[PDB]
Amino acid sequence: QYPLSRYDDRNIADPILRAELRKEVMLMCESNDKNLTIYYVLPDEQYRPDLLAYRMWGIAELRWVVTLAAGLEDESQGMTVGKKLKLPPATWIREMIRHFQYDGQVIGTLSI
Amino acid sequence: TKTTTAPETDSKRTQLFLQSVSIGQNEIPREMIVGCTYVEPGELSGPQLMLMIRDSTAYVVNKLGVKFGTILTVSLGDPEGHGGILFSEEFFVLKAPRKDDTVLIYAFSNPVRLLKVPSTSAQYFVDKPPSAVVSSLAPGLKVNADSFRKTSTYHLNVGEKPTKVLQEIARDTGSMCWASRGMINFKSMEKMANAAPSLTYESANPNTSGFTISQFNILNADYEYQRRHNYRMASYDMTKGVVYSGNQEDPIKFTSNPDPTALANYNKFILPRLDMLVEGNAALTPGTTLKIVVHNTAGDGELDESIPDKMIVMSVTHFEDRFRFVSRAQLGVVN
Amino acid sequence: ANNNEIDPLLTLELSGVKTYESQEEAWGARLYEWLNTYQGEVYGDPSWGNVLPQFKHEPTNLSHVQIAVEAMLLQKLTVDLPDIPISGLSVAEGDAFDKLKISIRIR
Amino acid sequence: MQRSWFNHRLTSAKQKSLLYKSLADLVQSMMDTFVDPWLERITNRKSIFSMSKEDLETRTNELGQFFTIRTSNSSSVPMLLQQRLDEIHFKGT
Amino acid sequence: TPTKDSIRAEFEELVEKDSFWSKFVGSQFVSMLTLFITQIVYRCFQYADAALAEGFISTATRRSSILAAAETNSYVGTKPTPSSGMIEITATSEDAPAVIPKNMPLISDDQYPYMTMDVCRLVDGTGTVEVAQLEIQEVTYTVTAAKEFLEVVLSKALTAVCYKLEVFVTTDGKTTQWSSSTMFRLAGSKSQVYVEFYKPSEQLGVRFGDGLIGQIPPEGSTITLKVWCTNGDITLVAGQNLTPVDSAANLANLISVKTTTPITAGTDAETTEITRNRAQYYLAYDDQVVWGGDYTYFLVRNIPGLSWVKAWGEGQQEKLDGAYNVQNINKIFISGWHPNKSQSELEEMILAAFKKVPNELNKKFSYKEVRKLPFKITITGRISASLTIENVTDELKSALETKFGRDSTFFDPNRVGKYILIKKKDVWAFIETLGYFRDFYLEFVEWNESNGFYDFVYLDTENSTFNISY
Amino acid sequence: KTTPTKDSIRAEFEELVEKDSFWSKFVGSQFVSMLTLFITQIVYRCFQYADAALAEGFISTATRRSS
Amino acid sequence: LEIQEVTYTVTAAKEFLEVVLSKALTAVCYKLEVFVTTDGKTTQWSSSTMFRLAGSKSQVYVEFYKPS
Amino acid sequence: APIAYGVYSQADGVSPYLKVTLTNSQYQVTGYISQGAAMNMAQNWESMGSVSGALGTTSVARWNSLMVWEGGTPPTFTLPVTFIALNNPFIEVSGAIAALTAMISPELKAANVGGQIPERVTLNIGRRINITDVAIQDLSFDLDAPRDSNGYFLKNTVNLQLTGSSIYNSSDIVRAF
């Protein structure tokens, strides 16, 4: 058995159900919250989102967040150098992943 | 399906008592284990184990998932020390609290754990030999028995452990039970008194050819254990009336089984006499007979006559810390 | 005690690619691919590589800059390559005016 | 992908070695030949005017379970699909 | 359509063409790399094919993709219906019994909830009443600001047990119902409407409109959702005791027991294939019922349990029986079959359900009774003698009865309203597909061609004779 | 496995490589690890591209305004 | 008769791929059937006496008894 | 790039063999060696044994007749560094003390858990003894040193205690020299 890092989006096995978590992450990345960080794409990070993920958070498995926020479907498509990105912290991402892995309900559900 | 695989060549290290611990096919690094306590009792209470594992990174419980139902593969032995024995057993985890960046694991032996499960449905053995009952109750252990004579009837009700029936069989046959190292043992009490010793333990003798005792305890309370067995058994039989057995000057006590052979063996046991602590011998198992010689360390080197020459081992406890390997034993005499 | 490796850069030889078969030459190959990959150049594992660029523009004499850089070099080497035993570092001018030589010793 | 993406992700020391560069080019050529067209087909089905002809056949087969259509009668297939889907709303006129 | 052999051949050709790899190394370094790369490429191609196949709704293989495609073409499946029965016994035990209560909640021996639909009688000696499983639970949500759509989503468990949904909005002490609408087709800027939708995860929600095409729920107001919950398929036979709960003061006073009709009318939610077909047909359906199949679709959706229905206009009827008739103008004919209901009850249900049909004006509805034609077969075949003859005959009889019977699903393989008749080739294919026969022959007797409008051709297994040997 | 990690691919390579005279020597080495990582990058790219395109295909589950 | 099964996956082509049962299963054994599944289709493989007349595409196997 | 302090420059005429440098990711401090520096190590060799169980197989299982090993300590240091100003008092004497005071303290406002622990330094005594991952334990300095007309120290002395972070093997400790 090969364990998957706790920061991987592959932790949800269905590509359709992962869409809700991706939507939540993208919606947060475009907001104007007060504990985001502003990062510009450097000239040596055009094709390598892993380098950006390591330089910002210190974790290399968070490259899917960088690919999502930049606006690309493919990792081989180059990013625009100098694009302004806003990226959330890591504990928030881990908490969202845990919630959607073990509960899997919409953020605004009403229960009794 | 389960596959039998070869041991890995990355384990080049040899230890004192605890050799390796694994969960399935993955190994917990041995240097992380700081405690170990292995207990082999003289009755059907099964071998026990307790491991203290240092976990500051939250790895043992968090990522490995150690809780009720985890099966550990433990290799215990001593191929270089006083007794060169080596064996492997499987353990079943009951609970594992985590305190102060440490985890304490309480485990029970799997073949005996299966014998300590309450029964969902009742089983009755009508007029069956004891061998069939033992084989049907515990089909995973090798049977070592010499004291089966007759046939009788046994009952196992709902919610009762299968160990109760085995203990009743032991009482009716007059033998001693203990399950260790893949076997279940029934050994008669009358033949144990005439067994020759196998090891020699001496005190206050530095030129001995055997081993040495470092600390020992003398118990003189023989009434504390004989108080419970000082009764005259009686029971009712529909074709004979009232059936007695035992002494003639003791108080009477009623039981239910009117079997003369079962009544005769109702009051047999082993009387503990001595407790001792030695330097880690892994060949000490219950049922072993030893020769004990004790010298005095002052006055004129007089031998202590209050300790009998031959004794039987009843309980054994082995203990390893990060620096030393020690054993403790309880010795007794057949009444 | 039987560790073998291929040349990190597959270098042609009469038989084919070079192979190193010993316990001491294997360390040579490992340290050879080190100093050849700058930090972050590996597509995976961004935190693995070399810190030689920071030596580039400084006086060839002794200065506190060199004493600063050597500590980072040794610490990074210990982090990336724990098993290999390394004994020291020596930097000194060599050949022409511009050149500088860095030597790492495995003992 | 592009004409030298996978090769360009090697370290600068290995890019000048012949065998590594050749291996990277071979792997990229194999992946482009056998894998890429299906991924491109997946990504190009958003708009009816950009799909390939096999996906158009699939959508027309989906539409054909309820109406009787022959695609060779009209000048274009995407126009047929879009116009029929639009005239569905005008039922009865 | 690549395979491993083709991948390996292409790799070998590519390696041969290259200048460096073909010359500088050979026969050991290359051999393992070939296998490794071919394996990896084949795995990647298979994954790409699987994703592309799952892309569309017709070829989807997982339920989540089907649900997403159904949400794109806004569709909400049929919801479960409660089981219904009668409790003719409500005899009192002491004085002062419940003279006339209504909607009294009850619990029956399995902690399942029931309630009485109508008031009981004066229970002079005993009273008669009907019951259903329905239970009512509510949830409320306040509004902090105008979010311009304000979607409200129920929990997974509550959406599992749901029969109806009612929405109330309370503002400055006044409360009113808000009606539902199909999209926002004809409402704007004051209408109080909402639209239901289904999430890819099984959750049911309500979406309020924009400012232009709806009325945003005003700030400082509470929205109340009232749900009628029912378990799908539960049956309680007879003579069992039902005890009041909540209104439990009557438990000592009264006695309620099961008698007469058991509760057996339960129904569960849709399956995957039915949802797949109905979501596709919903695109052509819209909400207007002008075309011929729309009436059948509406009838199948509204009334549960039907096998098949068919509708024909004036032209087909005039080509069928009468040359010309003025009364045939703007007339619609309906015919169908229901396994557990008589034809008179079906007729009672059809026009009653048609009162709510969309696009109704200048239209007259008629019903035509069905005619049944037995049909029969004879078979002569030789078995391999490994199996007994009697077992083969019994299994074949059971299989034919289930597949081609009157109560079979052959007439509507999917629940979409359609009439699929029986052809000769189907029998030949099906009997072979089972595979007991090494060789067999079929002869059809008493077979009558069907109009397709009101004719019915099932299969009678009992009359058919089987000839088996070898 | 549907989710390919570096360790799984290295294990696959080690499983295939054995019983070969030349290659079995270099089972535990840095060269094999680097090669396996460099190869796994492409597999990761393809799998993630397929998943992202499938997700972005529908209007209901699209995560961007442009799609 | 009672039924029970065991399965073994193939990581690589080992050119003979012998599969050995446990002692307890061999003790109580009456028949043995072999099924092979590749890409969603399963088929039976017939037994043969050594390899007397089969080659290069036949689906055959040989039974044997170990000293244990 | 760390920020330099202390007596790092060569204008005073003292060889680098008589100076101690402490380096980390933020600061770099250089000073002299005073008259009382030292390096220490220790091991623990040994109750449970009794006279009656002695003797007149490995040597580890016999703990009643031979000596037993329990554990050891990482190497420790006591360095009373010294600074004296010659050209600019702030960057030599009054800045080094603040740099050391910053290196001894934690940083509790950082986002990661590992960034909150006091950081570790690299010790290089002269040019020939180098040890990595050294943790600073104690620190002290005097307050009656001579002052400049602007109020900055013209001389000071700092007493430090340093420790290793792990027990060293026989082969590894030789490399440190």
Side-chain angles (χ1 to χ4, degrees), chain C residues 31-78:
Chain C
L31 205 66
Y32 188 45
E33 70 182 353
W34 214 86
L35 306 105
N36 266 347
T37 89
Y38 296 103
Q39 178 169 357
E41 298 219 317
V42 199
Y43 189 20
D45 193 8
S47 77
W48 198 86
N50 184 15
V51 284
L52 254 56
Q54 322 187 5
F55 275 106
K56 263 166 74 53
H57 292 270
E58 90 211 327
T60 39
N61 257 46
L62 187 46
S63 78
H64 55 270
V65 188
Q66 288 181 11
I67 316 182
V69 181
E70 313 199 34
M72 261 66 68
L73 209 162
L74 289 162
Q75 161 72 317
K76 194 85 198 68
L77 209 175
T78 63

Coordinates of all heavy atoms in Angstrom, one line a residue, chain C residues 31-78:
Chain C
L31 N 28.7 12.0 -5.0 CA 29.1 13.4 -4.9 C 29.4 14.0 -6.3 O 29.6 15.2 -6.4 CB 30.4 13.4 -4.1 CG 30.7 14.8 -3.4 CD1 29.6 15.1 -2.4 CD2 32.0 14.8 -2.8
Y32 N 29.5 13.2 -7.4 CA 29.7 13.7 -8.7 C 28.4 14.3 -9.2 O 28.4 15.4 -9.9 CB 30.2 12.7 -9.6 CG 30.6 13.3 -11.0 CD1 31.3 14.4 -11.1 CD2 30.2 12.6 -12.2 CE1 31.7 15.0 -12.3 CE2 30.6 13.1 -13.4 CZ 31.3 14.3 -13.5 OH 31.7 14.8 -14.7
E33 N 27.3 13.7 -9.0 CA 26.0 14.3 -9.4 C 25.7 15.5 -8.6 O 25.1 16.5 -9.1 CB 24.9 13.3 -9.5 CG 24.4 12.8 -8.1 CD 23.2 11.8 -8.3 OE1 22.8 11.6 -9.4 OE2 22.8 11.2 -7.3
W34 N 26.0 15.4 -7.3 CA 26.1 16.7 -6.5 C 27.2 17.6 -7.1 O 28.1 17.1 -7.7 CB 26.3 16.3 -5.0 CG 25.7 17.2 -4.0 CD1 24.4 17.1 -3.5 CD2 26.3 18.3 -3.3 NE1 24.2 18.1 -2.6 CE2 25.3 18.8 -2.5 CE3 27.5 18.9 -3.4 CZ2 25.5 19.9 -1.7 CZ3 27.7 20.0 -2.6 CH2 26.8 20.5 -1.7
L35 N 27.0 18.9 -6.9 CA 27.8 19.9 -7.5 C 27.5 20.0 -9.0 O 28.1 20.9 -9.6 CB 29.3 19.7 -7.3 CG 29.9 19.6 -5.9 CD1 30.3 18.1 -5.6 CD2 31.1 20.5 -5.7
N36 N 26.7 19.2 -9.6 CA 26.3 19.3 -10.9 C 24.8 19.7 -11.1 O 24.4 20.1 -12.2 CB 26.5 17.9 -11.7 CG 27.8 17.9 -12.4 OD1 28.5 18.9 -12.6 ND2 28.2 16.7 -12.8
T37 N 24.0 19.6 -10.0 CA 22.6 20.0 -10.0 C 22.5 21.2 -9.1 O 22.6 21.0 -7.9 CB 21.7 18.9 -9.7 OG1 21.5 18.8 -8.3 CG2 22.2 17.5 -10.2
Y38 N 22.2 22.4 -9.6 CA 21.9 23.5 -8.7 C 20.6 23.3 -8.0 O 19.7 22.5 -8.4 CB 21.9 24.8 -9.5 CG 23.2 25.1 -10.1 CD1 23.4 24.9 -11.5 CD2 24.3 25.7 -9.4 CE1 24.6 25.2 -12.1 CE2 25.5 26.0 -10.0 CZ 25.6 25.8 -11.3 OH 26.8 26.1 -11.9
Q39 N 20.5 24.0 -6.8 CA 19.3 23.8 -6.0 C 18.0 24.2 -6.8 O 18.0 25.3 -7.4 CB 19.4 24.6 -4.7 CG 18.1 24.5 -3.9 CD 18.4 25.1 -2.5 OE1 19.5 25.5 -2.1 NE2 17.3 25.1 -1.7
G40 N 17.0 23.4 -6.8 CA 15.7 23.6 -7.5 C 15.7 23.2 -8.9 O 14.6 23.3 -9.5
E41 N 16.8 22.7 -9.5 CA 16.8 22.3 -10.9 C 16.1 20.9 -11.0 O 15.5 20.7 -12.1 CB 18.2 22.2 -11.4 CG 18.9 23.6 -11.4 CD 19.7 23.8 -12.7 OE1 20.4 22.8 -13.1 OE2 19.7 24.9 -13.2
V42 N 16.1 20.1 -10.0 CA 15.4 18.8 -10.1 C 13.9 19.1 -10.2 O 13.4 19.8 -9.4 CB 15.8 17.9 -8.9 CG1 15.4 16.5 -9.2 CG2 17.2 18.1 -8.6
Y43 N 13.2 18.4 -11.1 CA 11.8 18.7 -11.4 C 11.0 18.4 -10.1 O 10.3 19.2 -9.6 CB 11.3 18.0 -12.6 CG 9.9 18.4 -13.0 CD1 9.4 19.6 -12.7 CD2 9.2 17.5 -13.9 CE1 8.1 19.9 -13.1 CE2 7.9 17.9 -14.3 CZ 7.4 19.1 -13.9 OH 6.1 19.4 -14.3
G44 N 11.2 17.1 -9.6 CA 10.7 16.8 -8.3 C 11.7 17.1 -7.2 O 12.9 17.4 -7.5
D45 N 11.3 17.1 -6.0 CA 12.2 17.4 -4.9 C 13.0 18.7 -5.0 O 14.2 18.6 -5.3 CB 13.1 16.2 -4.6 CG 13.8 16.3 -3.3 OD1 13.5 17.2 -2.5 OD2 14.7 15.5 -3.0
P46 N 12.3 19.8 -4.9 CA 13.0 21.1 -5.2 C 14.2 21.3 -4.2 O 15.1 22.1 -4.6 CB 11.9 22.2 -5.0 CG 10.7 21.4 -5.2 CD 10.9 20.0 -4.7
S47 N 14.1 20.8 -3.0 CA 15.2 21.0 -2.0 C 16.2 20.0 -2.1 O 16.4 19.1 -1.2 CB 14.5 21.1 -0.6 OG 14.2 19.8 -0.1
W48 N 17.1 20.0 -3.1 CA 18.2 19.1 -3.3 C 19.1 19.8 -4.3 O 18.7 20.0 -5.5 CB 17.7 17.8 -3.8 CG 18.7 16.7 -3.6 CD1 18.9 15.9 -2.5 CD2 19.7 16.2 -4.6 NE1 19.9 15.0 -2.7 CE2 20.4 15.2 -4.0 CE3 20.0 16.6 -5.9 CZ2 21.4 14.5 -4.6 CZ3 21.0 15.9 -6.5 CH2 21.7 14.9 -5.9
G49 N 20.3 20.1 -3.9 CA 21.3 20.6 -4.9 C 22.5 21.3 -4.2 O 22.8 21.0 -3.1
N50 N 23.0 22.3 -5.0 CA 24.3 22.8 -4.8 C 24.2 24.3 -4.4 O 23.2 25.0 -4.8 CB 25.2 22.6 -6.0 CG 26.6 23.1 -5.8 OD1 27.0 23.3 -4.7 ND2 27.3 23.2 -6.9
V51 N 25.2 24.8 -3.7 CA 25.2 26.2 -3.3 C 26.5 26.9 -3.8 O 26.9 27.9 -3.3 CB 25.0 26.5 -1.8 CG1 23.6 26.3 -1.5 CG2 25.9 25.5 -1.1
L52 N 27.2 26.3 -4.8 CA 28.4 26.9 -5.4 C 28.2 28.3 -6.0 O 29.2 29.1 -6.1 CB 29.0 26.0 -6.4 CG 30.3 25.2 -5.9 CD1 30.0 24.4 -4.6 CD2 30.8 24.3 -7.0
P53 N 27.0 28.7 -6.6 CA 26.9 30.0 -7.2 C 27.3 31.2 -6.3 O 27.9 32.2 -6.8 CB 25.5 30.1 -7.6 CG 25.0 28.7 -7.7 CD 26.0 27.8 -7.1
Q54 N 27.1 31.1 -5.0 CA 27.3 32.2 -4.2 C 28.8 32.5 -4.0 O 29.1 33.6 -3.4 CB 26.6 32.0 -2.8 CG 25.3 31.3 -2.9 CD 24.6 31.2 -1.6 OE1 25.0 31.7 -0.6 NE2 23.4 30.5 -1.7
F55 N 29.7 31.7 -4.5 CA 31.1 31.9 -4.4 C 31.6 32.8 -5.6 O 32.7 33.2 -5.6 CB 31.9 30.6 -4.5 CG 32.1 29.9 -3.2 CD1 31.4 28.8 -2.9 CD2 33.1 30.4 -2.3 CE1 31.6 28.2 -1.7 CE2 33.3 29.8 -1.1 CZ 32.6 28.6 -0.8
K56 N 30.7 33.2 -6.5 CA 31.1 33.6 -7.8 C 31.9 34.9 -7.8 O 33.0 35.0 -8.3 CB 29.9 33.8 -8.8 CG 29.7 32.5 -9.6 CD 28.3 32.6 -10.3 CE 28.2 33.6 -11.4 NZ 29.3 33.4 -12.4
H57 N 31.4 36.0 -7.2 CA 32.0 37.3 -7.3 C 32.3 37.7 -5.8 O 31.5 38.4 -5.1 CB 31.0 38.3 -7.9 CG 30.8 38.0 -9.4 ND1 31.6 38.6 -10.4 CD2 29.9 37.3 -10.0 CE1 31.2 38.2 -11.6 NE2 30.2 37.4 -11.4
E58 N 33.6 37.4 -5.4 CA 34.2 37.8 -4.2 C 35.7 37.8 -4.3 O 36.2 37.0 -5.1 CB 33.7 37.0 -3.0 CG 34.5 35.8 -2.8 CD 33.8 34.6 -2.2 OE1 32.8 34.8 -1.5 OE2 34.1 33.4 -2.5
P59 N 36.4 38.5 -3.5 CA 37.9 38.5 -3.6 C 38.4 37.1 -3.3 O 37.9 36.4 -2.4 CB 38.3 39.5 -2.5 CG 37.1 39.7 -1.6 CD 35.9 39.5 -2.5
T60 N 39.5 36.8 -4.0 CA 40.1 35.5 -3.8 C 40.9 35.3 -2.5 O 41.2 34.2 -2.1 CB 41.0 35.2 -5.0 OG1 41.7 36.4 -5.3 CG2 40.3 34.7 -6.1
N61 N 41.1 36.4 -1.8 CA 41.7 36.4 -0.5 C 40.7 35.9 0.6 O 39.6 35.6 0.3 CB 42.3 37.7 -0.1 CG 43.8 37.8 -0.3 OD1 44.4 37.4 -1.3 ND2 44.5 38.4 0.7
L62 N 41.2 35.9 1.8 CA 40.3 35.5 2.9 C 39.4 36.6 3.4 O 39.9 37.8 3.5 CB 41.1 35.0 4.1 CG 40.3 34.3 5.2 CD1 39.3 33.4 4.7 CD2 41.2 33.6 6.2
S63 N 38.1 36.4 3.5 CA 37.2 37.4 4.0 C 36.0 36.6 4.7 O 35.9 35.4 4.6 CB 36.7 38.2 2.8 OG 35.7 37.5 2.1
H64 N 35.3 37.4 5.4 CA 34.2 36.8 6.2 C 33.1 36.2 5.3 O 32.3 35.4 5.8 CB 33.6 37.9 7.2 CG 33.1 39.1 6.5 ND1 33.9 40.2 6.3 CD2 31.9 39.4 6.0 CE1 33.2 41.1 5.7 NE2 32.0 40.7 5.5
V65 N 33.0 36.6 4.1 CA 32.1 36.1 3.1 C 32.3 34.6 2.9 O 31.4 33.8 2.9 CB 32.1 36.9 1.8 CG1 30.9 36.4 0.9 CG2 32.0 38.4 2.1
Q66 N 33.6 34.2 2.7 CA 33.9 32.8 2.5 C 33.6 32.0 3.8 O 33.0 30.9 3.7 CB 35.4 32.6 2.2 CG 35.8 33.1 0.8 CD 37.3 32.9 0.5 OE1 38.0 32.2 1.3 NE2 37.7 33.4 -0.6
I67 N 33.9 32.5 5.0 CA 33.6 31.8 6.2 C 32.1 31.7 6.4 O 31.6 30.7 7.1 CB 34.3 32.5 7.4 CG1 35.7 32.9 7.0 CG2 34.3 31.6 8.6 CD1 36.5 33.6 8.1
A68 N 31.4 32.6 5.8 CA 29.9 32.5 5.9 C 29.4 31.4 4.9 O 28.7 30.5 5.3 CB 29.2 33.8 5.5
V69 N 30.0 31.3 3.7 CA 29.4 30.4 2.7 C 29.8 29.0 3.0 O 29.0 28.1 2.7 CB 29.9 30.8 1.3 CG1 29.3 29.9 0.3 CG2 29.5 32.3 1.0
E70 N 31.0 28.7 3.6 CA 31.4 27.4 3.9 C 30.4 26.7 4.8 O 30.2 25.5 4.7 CB 32.8 27.3 4.4 CG 33.8 28.2 3.7 CD 35.3 27.8 3.9 OE1 35.5 26.5 4.1 OE2 36.1 28.6 3.9
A71 N 29.9 27.4 5.8 CA 29.0 26.8 6.8 C 27.7 26.3 6.1 O 27.3 25.2 6.3 CB 28.7 27.8 7.9
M72 N 27.2 27.2 5.2 CA 26.0 26.8 4.5 C 26.3 25.6 3.6 O 25.4 24.7 3.5 CB 25.4 27.9 3.7 CG 24.3 28.7 4.3 SD 24.6 29.5 5.8 CE 25.7 30.8 5.2
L73 N 27.4 25.6 2.9 CA 27.8 24.5 2.1 C 27.8 23.2 2.9 O 27.2 22.2 2.5 CB 29.1 24.7 1.4 CG 29.3 24.1 0.0 CD1 30.4 24.8 -0.7 CD2 29.6 22.6 0.1
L74 N 28.5 23.2 4.0 CA 28.6 21.9 4.8 C 27.3 21.5 5.3 O 27.0 20.3 5.3 CB 29.7 22.2 5.9 CG 31.1 22.2 5.5 CD1 32.0 22.9 6.6 CD2 31.7 20.9 5.1
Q75 N 26.5 22.4 5.8 CA 25.2 22.0 6.4 C 24.3 21.5 5.3 O 23.6 20.4 5.5 CB 24.5 23.2 7.1 CG 23.0 23.1 7.3 CD 22.7 22.1 8.4 OE1 23.2 21.0 8.5 NE2 21.7 22.5 9.2
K76 N 24.2 22.1 4.1 CA 23.4 21.5 3.0 C 23.9 20.2 2.6 O 23.2 19.3 2.3 CB 23.5 22.5 1.8 CG 22.4 22.2 0.8 CD 21.1 22.9 1.1 CE 19.9 22.2 0.4 NZ 19.7 20.8 0.8
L77 N 25.3 20.0 2.6 CA 25.8 18.7 2.3 C 25.4 17.6 3.3 O 25.1 16.5 2.9 CB 27.4 18.8 2.2 CG 28.1 17.8 1.2 CD1 29.6 18.2 1.2 CD2 27.9 16.4 1.6
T78 N 25.4 18.0 4.6 CA 25.0 17.0 5.6 C 23.5 16.7 5.4 O 23.1 15.5 5.6 CB 25.3 17.5 7.0 OG1 24.5 18.7 7.2 CG2 26.7 17.8 7.2

